[PDB]
Structure 1
Amino acid sequence: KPETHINLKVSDGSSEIFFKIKKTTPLRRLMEAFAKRQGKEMDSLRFLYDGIRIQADQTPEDLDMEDNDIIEAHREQIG
């Protein structure tokens, strides 16, 4: 029984959230879960990984993410 998910961390400096996500799951769900845990909508936040602002349809696989990678979240302009 593999083991389909990787670990990701999303942080904004204060709020830090740990995710277990599939390589093939769109990051929309992670971005939505993080924003909405803030009581915000996905589109009020920007998510950064490797000099790139992540878009909702991208997967960890599209971005070559690795187990234990970190996503930076910040206020204003998504998505």
Structure 2
Amino acid sequence: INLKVSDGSSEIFFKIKKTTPLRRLMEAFAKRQGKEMDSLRFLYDGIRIQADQTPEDLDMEDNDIIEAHREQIG
């Protein structure tokens, strides 16, 4: 499955399996920004993503977009 992460100032596409936890992507994308995973808030279907969740768990479809917002707390 292919996916994309966008914060508005940058976009990075990712390719991973459906049972791979999204922990890797969120850390990968945040590393590019010079920020650790916690300081960013990731959204799919309007819902905050958690590190142990897989695309199969969230019923993702190929070529979906993931929104990356600056986490304001912490």
What interval of TM-score do these two structures reach, taking the shorter chain for normalisation? over 0.9
- 2:47 counterpart residue number: 52
- Does the 8 Å CA contact 1:17/1:34 hold for their aligned counterparts? yes
In 2: Cα distance, 1:36 partner to 1:9 partner = 15
Could you say what secondary structure the match of 2:60 adopts? coil
Change over 3 Å in CA distance of 1:78–1:61 after alignment to 2: farther
The Cα offsets for residues 51-77 of structure 1, whole Å up to 9 and x where unpaired, read as: 210000000110001100000001115
Could you tell me which runs of 5 or more consecutive residues in structure 1 were left unpaired when the two chains were aligned. Answer: 1-5
- Does the 8 Å CA contact 1:42/1:78 hold for their aligned counterparts? no
How high is the TM-score relative to the length of structure 1? 0.88
Shift of 1:78: 8.6
How high is the TM-score relative to the length of structure 2? 0.94
Moved over 2 A (4+): none
Q: What root-mean-square deviation, in Å, do the aligned CA atoms of Structure 1 and Structure 2 show?
A: 1.8
What is the aligned-residue identity percentage?
A: 100
Could you tell me which runs of 5 or more consecutive residues in structure 2 were left unpaired when the two chains were aligned. Answer: none
* Bigger relative contact order (CA 8 A; separation at least 6): 2
